[PDB]
Amino acid sequence: DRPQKPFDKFFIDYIGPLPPSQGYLYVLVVVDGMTGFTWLYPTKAPSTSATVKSLNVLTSIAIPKVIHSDQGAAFTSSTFAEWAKERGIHLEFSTPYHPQSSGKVERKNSDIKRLLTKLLVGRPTKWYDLLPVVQLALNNTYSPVLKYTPHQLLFGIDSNTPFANQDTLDLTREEELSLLQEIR
Amino acid sequence: DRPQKPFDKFFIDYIGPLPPSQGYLYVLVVVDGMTGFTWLYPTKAPSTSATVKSLNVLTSIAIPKVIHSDQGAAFTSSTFAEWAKERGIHLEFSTPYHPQSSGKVERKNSDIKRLLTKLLVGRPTKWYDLLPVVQLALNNTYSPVLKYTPHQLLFGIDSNTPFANQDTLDLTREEELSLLQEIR
Amino acid sequence: LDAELDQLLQGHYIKGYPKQYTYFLEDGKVKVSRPEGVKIIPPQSDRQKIVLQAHNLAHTGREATLLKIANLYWWPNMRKDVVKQLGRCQQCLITNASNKASGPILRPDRPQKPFDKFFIDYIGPLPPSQGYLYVLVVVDGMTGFTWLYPTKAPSTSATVKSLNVLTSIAIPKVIHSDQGAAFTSSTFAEWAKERGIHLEFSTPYHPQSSGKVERKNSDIKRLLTKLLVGRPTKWYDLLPVVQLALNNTYSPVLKYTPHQLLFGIDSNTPFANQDTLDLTREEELSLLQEIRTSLYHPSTPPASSRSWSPVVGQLVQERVARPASLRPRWHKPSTVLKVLNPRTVVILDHLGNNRTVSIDNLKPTSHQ
Amino acid sequence: LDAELDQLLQGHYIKGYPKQYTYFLEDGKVKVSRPEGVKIIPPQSDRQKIVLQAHNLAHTGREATLLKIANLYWWPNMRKDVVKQLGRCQQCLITNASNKASGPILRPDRPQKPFDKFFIDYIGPLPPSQGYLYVLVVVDGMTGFTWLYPTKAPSTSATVKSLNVLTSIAIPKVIHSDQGAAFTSSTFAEWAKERGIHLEFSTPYHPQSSGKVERKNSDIKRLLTKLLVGRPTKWYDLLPVVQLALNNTYSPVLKYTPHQLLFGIDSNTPFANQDTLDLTREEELSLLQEIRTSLYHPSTPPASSRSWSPVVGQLVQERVARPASLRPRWHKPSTVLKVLNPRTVVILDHLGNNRTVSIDNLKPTSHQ
DNA sequence: TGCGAAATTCCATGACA
DNA sequence: ATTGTCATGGAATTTCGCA
DNA sequence: TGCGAAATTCCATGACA
DNA sequence: ATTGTCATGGAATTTCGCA
Numbered sequence A, B: 001d002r003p004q005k006p007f008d009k010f011f012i013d014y015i016g017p018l019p020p021s022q023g024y025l026y027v028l029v030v031v032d033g034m035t036g037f038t039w040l041y042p043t044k045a046p047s048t049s050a051t052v053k054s055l056n057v058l059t060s061i062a063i064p065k066v067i068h069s070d071q072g073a074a075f076t077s078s079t080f081a082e083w084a085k086e087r088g089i090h091l092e093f094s095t096p097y098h099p100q101s102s103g104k105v106e107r108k109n110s111d112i113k114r115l116l117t118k119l120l121v122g123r124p125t126k127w128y129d130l131l132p133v134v135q136l137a138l139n140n141t142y143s144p145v146l147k148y149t150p151h152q153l154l155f156g157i158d159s160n161t162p163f164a165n166q167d168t169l170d171l172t173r174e175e176e177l178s179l180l181q182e183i184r
Numbered sequence C, D: 001l002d003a004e005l006d007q008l009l010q011g012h013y014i015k016g017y018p019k020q021y022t023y024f025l026e027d028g029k030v031k032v033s034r035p036e037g038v039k040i041i042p043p044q045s046d047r048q049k050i051v052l053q054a055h056n057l058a059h060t061g062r063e064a065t066l067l068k069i070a071n072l073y074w075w076p077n078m079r080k081d082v083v084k085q086l087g088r089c090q091q092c093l094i095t096n097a098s099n100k101a102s103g104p105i106l107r108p109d110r111p112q113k114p115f116d117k118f119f120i121d122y123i124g125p126l127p128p129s130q131g132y133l134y135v136l137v138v139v140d141g142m143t144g145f146t147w148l149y150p151t152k153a154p155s156t157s158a159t160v161k162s163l164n165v166l167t168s169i170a171i172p173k174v175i176h177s178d179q180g181a182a183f184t185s186s187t188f189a190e191w192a193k194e195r196g197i198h199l200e201f202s203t204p205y206h207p208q209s210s211g212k213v214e215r216k217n218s219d220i221k222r223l224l225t226k227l228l229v230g231r232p233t234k235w236y237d238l239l240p241v242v243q244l245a246l247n248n249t250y251s252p253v254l255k256y257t258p259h260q261l262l263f264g265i266d267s268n269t270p271f272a273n274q275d276t277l278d279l280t281r282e283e284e285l286s287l288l289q290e291i292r293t294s295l296y297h298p299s300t301p302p303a304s305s306r307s308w309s310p311v312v313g314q315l316v317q318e319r320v321a322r323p324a325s326l327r328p329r330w331h332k333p334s335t336v337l338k339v340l341n342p343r344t345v346v347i348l349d350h351l352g353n354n355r356t357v358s359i360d361n362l363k364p365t366s367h368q
Numbered sequence E, G: 001t002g003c004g005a006a007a008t009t010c011c012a013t014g015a016c017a
Numbered sequence F, H: 001a002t003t004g005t006c007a008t009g010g011a012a013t014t015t016c017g018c019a
């Protein structure tokens, strides 16, 4: 059996609805299975159309052999199946109510959700502008299991933005108090 | 004493007034002394100004050492003297009432007057357009005294418009009759 | 296709499939263990589609297309099939640049006599001066003697007016011009026929062909610029000065000014040459004739190491004149009917017309 | 002047007036019988005016000026006085062309790593497509990997928007651009400082300096043209296709695609290479590092036989950027302060400023 | 019958929309 | 059915002045 | 240990406003 | 304070298949 590689499998999922930022409401999350590399795309809906528009960007950089998702409507539509067929991409679905990725991906998706929450508090409406720095953070974060960041695994070099502070990622007492205020 | 050359002496004179042609009334006549080459310039007046404008054209092609003329007003003015001085051209005047050129020039000026008269009859108002062909004729006319046309003496080659017909130059009986009509 | 590959699997020899490699079946496909690794040998009936798909990814040339194919496949003489497609891809043929230079320039013979051949051209538009915007430039081929006329337009009418004044002096056998609007009108053709003047045209879009006058345009503009430094660009009143100045300037290679080559004696201008002061005009005209024939004439330079020269029947392509944004820079392939000279040809073109065209506006079609 | 020529007439020897010729008086002027004939030797105090008058007829160079003078005069070392005036004629110095080529081009080292250096540039205006008219092109120096963004203007704002999306992936050490409006604004400088990105600028009016991206612009336009043949020029929807197509095209000299140099493995695109199928990612990244360092690098070509190279303190002249009609193509002479490299210099210029300038936009001032 | 220096010739370079 | 040209200023080469 | 032919490499040419 | 580049397709050169 051949060793696992970048582009072997992209794991995709939506996060949201979120507070409106520059008119956007969701984040399409794409994580490379082998490297843990993350790409994020702001969308206005979790629709097949927004998924195609977003993945059109990514797949103009690299094409995955397999896209893995849950049975979201956007991902099970025949339009999205057409799209993937056109590009020679195999589609892969977790069974309903039972999402399975890999340890690495699960953990990454977790960090993504937590990191978003942490920075959207105080500025719940400014997340659109922060997506770039979010991704750099995620992709320059040291992986305990492998000796390397996703950046390093994807490009085979060190990065010019090492995030040397492995961070709190937890909400400070002040943030817990004003998170219970904004959600009221 | 050095042999005579082109540009040694230009002989100039006005002919007119003539019937208006494209608004013009005179012809400035310039004849190179050595070669008998003729240049003609249509003017609206026998003035210093029209002479300068016309000679400015010619002297942007070749500059004579000496300009010879009679004591026309246009040629004795201090403006014209200034002009000639500016260009290193010596000015030369025949004594009043006693015009002297050379045999060659006299004869040429004669041909010019006669040829003009011949062609202005029938079309006394179309001479402006004919000046080019007049000049070619004059300049490609065989000189009995030298073995050569002015063209040949000026350029040292045969011409592409030889005027093989040495012409009548005399007015036919019909032309004498309609010359006595137009001048009535 | 299926027959060939079949006979191969059972160990028989087929021409062009080297014997020393082992050919097998796997996943329903013929394969072969080659030094680089295992490649799929597709059936011959599949190969055109493969080459085409590889090529079409980015419309790549020989090597870049081959390198894609070689990633998955091997067959005998792959590049032969790649080149086959390249020569058939209309889009590559008309978009790609040439990589073959024109053969070396001709140095036509100097006209034997003054007035044998005029070269004419327009300069402009220039900054408005006295309502004028252009200059008609007339250069006698043999002598280099130049006449300048200011115009308001590069028009047939203004050309005719100017040449009526010029041809007062003499009539030329031939007038050579480029294909400017002014010179190709039927009015101008008539004007010339009326005078027994033969009109000669440059091949289209090839200013080198009017090189004699073009080169004078340079000096004309260069002198005007110098005279106008730190003044407003009132060039009209300087045309005459420039004309006289240039006609009386020495060409260092010839040792004569154009005035001298035309008249064989300087007129009353500064630093007039006096060497023939003691000769008769006739002795002078005789020395002039000798001087005219013995002038330096340059020769055809060496060809560059990868030039091409036209051959009758060759597929060649004409450069598109004013190609629109994102459109091919070349026309469809056309054939060489006649080779007028090594730098000039007649082609049976894109419209089905005979066109006389400079080699500089042609590339040889690639891959035959 | 008068003293020198006096002592000459009475038969004494003066240095530089050869003894074997006879010098006399005639018409109030010193003369000499020289092989070509009798020439006037003017007093030395008159010679500058003579040389100047000769030169000014048509602002001629060494020989063409000399040949006028020689018609009437002779003196010792005439050309020395001619050259003296040439080097002092402001108008000739700023109007004339150079006749010395630039020294041979530098081939800068390929950036060692991906993201070390970006080269960016605009293409356009292109025909309107979905309201877009330009393309921002970003080329990674090391890999050749290219990103394309459609814009409505070559603006700082559109550049910033595009690079915010790009730098989501990674941040580059250096961004090299030309001096387009978009890249030199203080807003763009801030944007870069905010990210610890160093901005590097080409010398002005020298697109070779952005050669890495410029050269990609060619392929970009060439592929777009091919894809658009016989269709309306709806290029917007093809940018992504073109980007992917080019990033996955082999450079025949390197034997790698830019995608390969960036990732060390093909993604799911047609004809993906499979040679590292059995390596671990770590083994693969190790082979990649080896592949990155051993890439062909070209060398500085031979100098042409008449090139010049800048020397500190040299008088040189900068090419006028957009010279108006009939105005000099060169600025006034300026001095070379520092030689950054054989093709790049700092000059103390026409405004009294330090300018960093390409040799290609310079000529060495003639006659010192 | 040979030297140093000046003069002449050679010619690559660039620009004519 | 037509086709490059030639001013320019350093360098290379030749000629000159003298012996 | 050497041949004919294919494969690979060389590289001048031209175009990026 | 900065610097040309590289796809292209014939030709030149090297390698391959076989003996």
Ligand SMILES: O=C(NCc1ccc(F)cc1)c1nc(N2CCCCS2(=O)=O)c2cccnc2c1O
Binding pocket: C121, C122, C178, C179, C180, C204, C205, C206, C207, C208, C211, C214, E016, E017
């Ligand atoms: O003067 C010319 N100078 C350029 C030149 C001169 C000499 C040389 F060697 C190189 C270049 C010139 N160029 C013209 N063209 C305009 C650009 C598009 C097609 S073009 O044919 O190139 C042109 C067109 C129509 C009429 N007269 C024209 C003309 O005079």
Ligand SMILES: O=C(NCc1ccc(F)cc1)c1nc(N2CCCCS2(=O)=O)c2cccnc2c1O
Binding pocket: D121, D122, D178, D179, D180, D204, D205, D206, D207, D208, D211, D214, G016, G017
């Ligand atoms: O792309 C360029 N291609 C030409 C090119 C490319 C590569 C090569 F080797 C040669 C030529 C280009 N050219 C610009 N210029 C416009 C013309 C007047 C001055 S310029 O500087 O020449 C330019 C100016 C401003 C911003 N970007 C520019 C730019 O991108």
Ligand SMILES: [Mg+2]
Binding pocket: A013, A014, A070, A072
């Ligand atoms: Mg979901």
Ligand SMILES: [Mg+2]
Binding pocket: B013, B014, B070, B072
């Ligand atoms: Mg009178």
Ligand SMILES: [Mg+2]
Binding pocket: C121, C122, C178, C180
């Ligand atoms: Mg023209």
Ligand SMILES: [Mg+2]
Binding pocket: D121, D122, D178, D180
């Ligand atoms: Mg630019």
Ligand SMILES: [N+]
Binding pocket: C107, C108, C109
């Ligand atoms: N010829």
Ligand SMILES: [N+]
Binding pocket: D107, D108, D109
């Ligand atoms: N470098």
Ligand SMILES: [Zn+2]
Binding pocket: C055, C056, C059, C060, C089, C091, C092, C093, D226
């Ligand atoms: Zn193609």
Ligand SMILES: [Zn+2]
Binding pocket: C226, D055, D056, D059, D060, D089, D091, D092, D093
């Ligand atoms: Zn000058």
